[PDB]
Amino acid sequence: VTVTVNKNPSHTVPSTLYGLMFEDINHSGDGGLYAELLQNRAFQQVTPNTAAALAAWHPISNAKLAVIQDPSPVSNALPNSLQFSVPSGSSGRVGFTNEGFWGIKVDSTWTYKASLFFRFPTSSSFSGALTVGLQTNAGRVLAQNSTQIRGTTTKWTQINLELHPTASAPDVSNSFFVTIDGAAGAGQTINFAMFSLFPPTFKNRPNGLRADIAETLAEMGPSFFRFPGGNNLEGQTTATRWQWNATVGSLLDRPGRVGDWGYVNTDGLGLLEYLQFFEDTGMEPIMAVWAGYSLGGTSLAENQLAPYIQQAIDQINFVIGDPAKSAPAALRASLGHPEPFTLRFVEVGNEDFFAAGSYPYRWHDFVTALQAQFPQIRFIATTNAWNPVLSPVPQSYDVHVYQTPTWFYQNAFYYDGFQRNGTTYFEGEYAAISTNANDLFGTVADGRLAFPTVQSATGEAAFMTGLERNSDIVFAASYAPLLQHVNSTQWTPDLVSYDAGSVIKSTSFFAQKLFALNKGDQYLPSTLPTNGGTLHWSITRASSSGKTFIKIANAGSSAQSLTFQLTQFNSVSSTGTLQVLTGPETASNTPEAPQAIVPKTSTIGTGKTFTYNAPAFSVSVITVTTN
Ligand SMILES: *[C@@H]1O[C@H](CO)[C@@H](O[C@@H]2O[C@H](CO)[C@@H](O[C@@H]3O[C@H](CO)[C@@H](O)[C@H](O)[C@@H]3O)[C@H](O)[C@H]2NC(C)=O)[C@H](O)[C@H]1NC(C)=O
Ligand SMILES: *[C@@H]1O[C@H](CO)[C@@H](O[C@@H]2O[C@H](CO)[C@@H](O)[C@H](O)[C@H]2NC(C)=O)[C@H](O)[C@H]1NC(C)=O
Ligand SMILES: *[C@@H]1O[C@H](CO)[C@@H](O[C@@H]2O[C@H](CO)[C@@H](O)[C@H](O)[C@H]2NC(C)=O)[C@H](O)[C@H]1NC(C)=O
Ligand SMILES: *[C@@H]1O[C@H](CO)[C@@H](O[C@@H]2O[C@H](CO)[C@@H](O)[C@H](O)[C@H]2NC(C)=O)[C@H](O)[C@H]1NC(C)=O
Ligand SMILES: O=S(=O)(O)O[C@H]1C[C@H](O)[C@@H](O)[C@@H]1CO
Ligand SMILES: [Cl-]
């Protein structure tokens, strides 16, 4: 196909076109982006004296453990304590382990920060060393540190010890331990609360993010981060919804909540840690507010919304408020960030097409109140565009689609036929998730993708050339879900996978990176791809440099020649760079082969005419300078 590139831009490419969609799903938060290594670190939201309350915790030797509703809890937010007892006549090391999130990476090049709260609930004459550390589950101690504790310490006391492994573990099958001497400890009971083990964190933020994951997110050059959900915003009930104020301040004061993907969220990854991350990566937030619906199916009645509307105002005030004018803005100042953060976009709820009967009145009351408080914020509706009819008129819709790779390339013209009437669109949740149109949400046996494939990434890439072409109205687009702990998956495929030790960058990750990093501010119209065809492209240009990004998605099984005609330009560079992601249709980056499919960079000859053969199942970026 001959592709003529117009030198006259048709529109400015939004700065926000490519970004991330995040909630705590597949242990993306706890066990993932949040650096905390202990699972169930503070016994949040578990029933005392049950096995499940002890989840991730194990005795060493004849230790007696129970999670108790502590008569004197470490805080109002953390009512549960680990009751540790050493039987009479004990000897040797007695204590307990935390297995982490399906392991703990033990790296001798890292310093770990261990901490816990303890008291003796009954004063004793105990005198001895409390030892914390890392051991292999095979039984080798790799790191240890200790401090002197006394049985007369009946008030909650924090212990803070660094750990230095003598050796890196050969695998992540390692545990955190706490021990005391069994003879010195015989007959003692100690209550513990609020454990923590941190590796070094991204940007050395002290309640921060796991470095390799945070760096992988930053790598993708995202412009925005939509948070905190997603289903995980909504709760199963009103009472279990995400609440901003429960996620800020001291970890002692965060009660956590049962999330919407089968596990407790610590809320250690809380509103301030999110905003701090955005500051660290140059991302701007698309912040969701809860909108009076939870996943059990309960809508708040119109006459129940006011306190939830105020809580949404509170949440936004924490982010952007003048600290002199609201308690939440003063709270942000009190936590060391007096300067407001950036916030231009707020999403009202999540997938309110599931509650399309009540969203009209929920949208109406929330947005009337919020737009009056925050006239410069753009509020994003979550129902199907224009059905139901919303008031006030939404300035933006969040459009979701899970579909087959084929659907993505066949629907690259999704936005071409939309009216340009000041409405902007956020493709806030999309992925090619299955090769089976008849069973998108099914098993891997029935066509579900366990990981993104070259097929899925190339289909998505074709769809993305359509998002870029239509970026006069499409302002934002994010793959979902973003993150996956391979040992705790509720949803596949996911953009970026990991275990306790390492990260797997998907084919779809590389498509997202190639699209986001090679994106100018000018959209250059070109010959239109065939609507329904496998081959798509999108061309943008950096107005400051003339760097021209020709992105090509071949989503089909056949190589396809493109001849680019740039005769309208005064000059084109005599060479360009080519970045290509390709491989076999069903090839995937997996835990076992995490670099099977990676982009390759070369130099190609260019000028006002050049020909490129886009391979079957390829994402290609050709970068030339045009003036
Ligand atoms: C985060 O902030 C929200 C408010 O934005 C706090 O929720 C509010 O908590 C109070 C105290 O529990 C609730 O008041 C209570 O309501 C019941 C039920 O009718 C009443 O029987 C009690 O005497 C009391 O008035 C209030 O309704 C609730 N509001 C909302 C919007 O949920 C929340 O507690 C804060 N979370 C944390 C951990 O600080
Ligand atoms: C045991 O942990 C303690 C507490 O973290 C370590 O002592 C700290 O060492 C760092 C770095 O040298 C200093 O900045 C702190 O001031 C120290 N604090 C105290 C109270 O000493 C100690 O190095 C650790 N020991 C081992 C063997 O890992
Ligand atoms: C912008 O244009 C869209 C089409 O892309 C309009 O959507 C129609 O809106 C009415 C209700 O207001 C619905 O009953 C129709 O079914 C919608 N059409 C389609 C094709 O979805 C939309 O109203 C326009 N918005 C503004 C602000 O003018
Ligand atoms: C977490 O998931 C990883 C990756 O799937 C598991 O490690 C794999 O285990 C399989 C099947 O037992 C092995 O044959 C693979 O070679 C392993 N892959 C890698 C890259 O190591 C790991 O066992 C899981 N952890 C837990 C605790 O279940
Ligand atoms: O029913 S789903 O399609 O899983 O919902 C998707 C959409 C929702 O915003 C998010 O939580 C979830 C996983 O990406
Ligand atoms: Cl398909």
Side-chain angles (χ1 to χ4, degrees), residues 77-139 141-154 156-324 326-375 377-384:
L78 300 178
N80 297 327
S81 291
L82 176 72
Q83 177 182 268
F84 165 70
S85 321
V86 176
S88 322
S90 305
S91 60
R93 84 195 269 268
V94 179
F96 47 92
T97 62
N98 190 282
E99 64 182 64
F101 298 96
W102 299 278
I104 298 168
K105 186 185 177 181
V106 178
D107 195 319
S108 61
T109 76
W110 293 356
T111 298
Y112 302 69
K113 288 181 176 172
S115 62
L116 59 79
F117 289 73
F118 87 91
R119 73 189 177 88
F120 288 81
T122 308
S123 186
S124 73
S125 63
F126 182 75
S127 190
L130 178 306
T131 307
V132 309
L134 293 161
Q135 66 177 37
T136 79
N137 293 340
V141 169
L142 287 188
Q144 68 182 107
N145 199 355
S146 69
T147 195
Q148 282 297 314
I149 62 167
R150 297 296 174 267
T152 51
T153 303
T154 56
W156 286 111
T157 304
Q158 193 182 45
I159 294 182
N160 291 277
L161 297 164
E162 295 184 353
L163 292 172
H164 307 278
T166 59
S168 296
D171 67 31
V172 297
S173 303
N174 312 294
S175 293
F176 175 69
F177 65 83
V178 176
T179 60
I180 63 169
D181 178 80
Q188 303 286 335
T189 298
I190 306 165
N191 291 5
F192 293 91
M194 189 58 245
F195 292 81
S196 184
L197 184 71
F198 263 75
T201 60
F202 180 67
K203 302 304 198 197
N204 301 315
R205 296 270 198 181
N207 186 38
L209 306 193
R210 178 167 150 177
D212 58 355
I213 300 173
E215 287 161 0
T216 301
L217 299 191
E219 181 182 330
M220 225 185 328
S223 54
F224 70 81
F225 190 104
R226 180 217 170 175
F227 84 104
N231 288 5
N232 208 56
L233 175 69
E234 289 185 292
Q236 290 307 129
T237 60
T238 301
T240 58
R241 77 195 182 277
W242 187 90
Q243 293 197 56
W244 78 271
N245 48 304
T247 80
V248 303
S250 159
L251 296 188
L252 285 172
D253 297 332
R254 301 188 196 186
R257 54 173 289 262
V258 175
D260 298 303
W261 296 108
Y263 57 94
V264 174
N265 290 200
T266 66
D267 281 336
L269 178 51
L271 178 51
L272 191 57
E273 294 77 16
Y274 282 116
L275 293 165
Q276 289 183 145
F277 181 55
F278 309 155
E279 178 174 277
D280 290 339
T281 58
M283 282 189 245
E284 72 179 287
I286 305 186
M287 187 170 67
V289 294
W290 194 79
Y293 173 89
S294 54
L295 288 153
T298 295
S299 290
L300 295 185
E302 186 167 2
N303 72 4
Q304 304 180 272
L305 300 179
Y308 304 94
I309 293 173
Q310 184 57 239
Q311 184 168 35
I313 291 170
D314 291 347
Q315 181 180 327
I316 292 166
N317 279 340
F318 182 84
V319 183
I320 71 162
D322 180 345
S326 80
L331 185 65
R332 179 199 66 251
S334 85
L335 293 162
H337 207 295
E339 296 315 332
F341 301 98
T342 296
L343 178 65
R344 297 203 291 139
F345 302 106
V346 163
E347 187 156 357
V348 181
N350 175 62
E351 297 219 314
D352 287 279
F353 53 86
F354 281 132
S358 67
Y359 198 61
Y361 75 69
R362 292 182 300 106
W363 167 267
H364 180 270
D365 284 356
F366 269 81
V367 179
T368 303
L370 285 170
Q371 201 76 83
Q373 281 296 316
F374 304 112
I377 294 181
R378 195 172 193 114
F379 289 97
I380 302 166
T382 65
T383 38
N384 299 322

Side-chain angles (χ1 to χ4, degrees), residues 351-375 377-546:
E351 297 219 314
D352 287 279
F353 53 86
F354 281 132
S358 67
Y359 198 61
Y361 75 69
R362 292 182 300 106
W363 167 267
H364 180 270
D365 284 356
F366 269 81
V367 179
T368 303
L370 285 170
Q371 201 76 83
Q373 281 296 316
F374 304 112
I377 294 181
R378 195 172 193 114
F379 289 97
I380 302 166
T382 65
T383 38
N384 299 322
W386 312 116
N387 185 5
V389 185
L390 300 177
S391 166
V393 175
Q395 284 194 298
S396 300
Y397 276 97
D398 181 3
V399 183
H400 294 188
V401 61
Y402 286 142
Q403 252 298 344
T404 65
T406 293
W407 180 97
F408 278 96
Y409 76 71
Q410 286 176 340
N411 283 276
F413 279 69
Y414 188 86
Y415 282 105
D416 289 75
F418 276 52
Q419 294 313 310
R420 276 51 187 177
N421 58 18
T423 312
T424 57
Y425 296 89
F426 174 27
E427 196 88 9
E429 187 194 72
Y430 75 96
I433 69 164
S434 179
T435 53
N436 185 354
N438 189 51
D439 194 16
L440 291 173
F441 307 107
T443 67
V444 172
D446 300 338
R448 187 76 171 264
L449 292 182
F451 296 101
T453 60
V454 178
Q455 191 187 356
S456 69
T458 59
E460 292 159 4
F463 187 77
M464 294 157 71
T465 65
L467 299 179
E468 192 165 271
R469 178 171 57 258
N470 295 291
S471 62
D472 55 325
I473 68 174
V474 175
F475 75 101
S478 49
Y479 190 106
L482 180 57
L483 283 176
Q484 178 194 12
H485 197 313
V486 294
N487 299 119
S488 192
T489 297
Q490 296 81 52
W491 184 282
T492 70
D494 305 289
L495 202 63
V496 172
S497 312
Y498 50 82
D499 71 355
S502 60
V503 168
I504 302 132
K505 300 172 199 177
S506 70
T507 51
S508 294
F509 172 85
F510 292 118
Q512 297 287 322
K513 187 185 168 170
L514 283 171
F515 273 61
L517 289 190
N518 304 280
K519 187 206 80 181
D521 61 286
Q522 297 175 338
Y523 180 76
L524 301 192
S526 55
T527 310
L528 289 168
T530 306
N531 188 336
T534 54
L535 186 64
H536 294 271
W537 51 89
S538 179
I539 310 171
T540 63
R541 179 170 177 281
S543 54
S544 64
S545 68

Side-chain angles (χ1 to χ4, degrees), residues 566-569 571-583:
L566 280 71
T567 57
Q568 294 186 18
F569 288 91
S571 59
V572 183
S573 62
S574 63
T575 65
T577 67
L578 171 73
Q579 309 169 254
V580 51
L581 181 76
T582 191

